[PDB]
Design a protein around this nucleic acid. Structure first.
Length: 78
DNA sequence: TGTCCCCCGCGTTTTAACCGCCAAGGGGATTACTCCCTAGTCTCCAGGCACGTGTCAGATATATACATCCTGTTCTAGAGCGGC
C-alpha cells in the first residue's frame, strides 16, 4: 500500500505540470500539412488532451485491471 | 598380437531446459453471400487408333585390330664379404 501510495504521489506531484504540458501541446502546423504527427493512440482514444491527466490515468488503470487495454498500448501512452 | 590413441566413467561448474505465469496478435476455425466453373447433354469433327507396308538402323559374321593384363628378361640399386 505504501509503495502504491508513493507511486501515485509521484504521479500527482508532477500532475499540475504534465496537465498544462499536454493542454498546451503546441503542434506545429507544417507537420499538420503533410501528416507526420503520431496519431497511433489518438484513433482509439488513448490521448490525454483536453482532460486532467490523473483522472484519465485512474480510468486507464481501471480498464487495465479490467483486461481490455492491450497492455503495451497503455505502456506507450504512459 | 600390440598399441596407442580414441572413447568412456566420473568430478566440477556453468547452462540453458522446464515448468510457473502473462499477455499478444497473427491466425485456425466457423458462418454466410455470392459468383464462376465445373457437373451434365447435343452434335460433330478432327486428332487418335488399327491396319498395311517401304524402309533404314541394328544384329549376325568374320578377318582385322585393339587392348590391357600377365609374365619373362634385363637394368640398377642395395647389402654382404673380402682385401689392403
Amino acid at each position: 500500500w505504501t509503495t502504491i501510495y508513493e507511486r501515485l504521489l509521484e504521479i500527482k506531484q508532477m500532475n499540475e505540470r504534465v496537465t498544462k504540458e499536454i493542454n498546451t501541446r503546441s503542434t506545429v502546423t507544417f507537420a499538420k500539412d503533410l501528416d507526420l504527427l503520431s496519431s497511433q493512440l489518438s484513433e482509439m482514444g488513448l490521448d490525454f488532451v483536453g482532460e486532467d491527466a490523473y483522472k484519465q490515468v485512474l480510468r486507464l488503470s481501471r480498464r487495465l485491471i479490467n483486461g481490455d487495454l492491450e497492455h503495451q498500448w497503455f505502456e506507450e501512452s504512459l
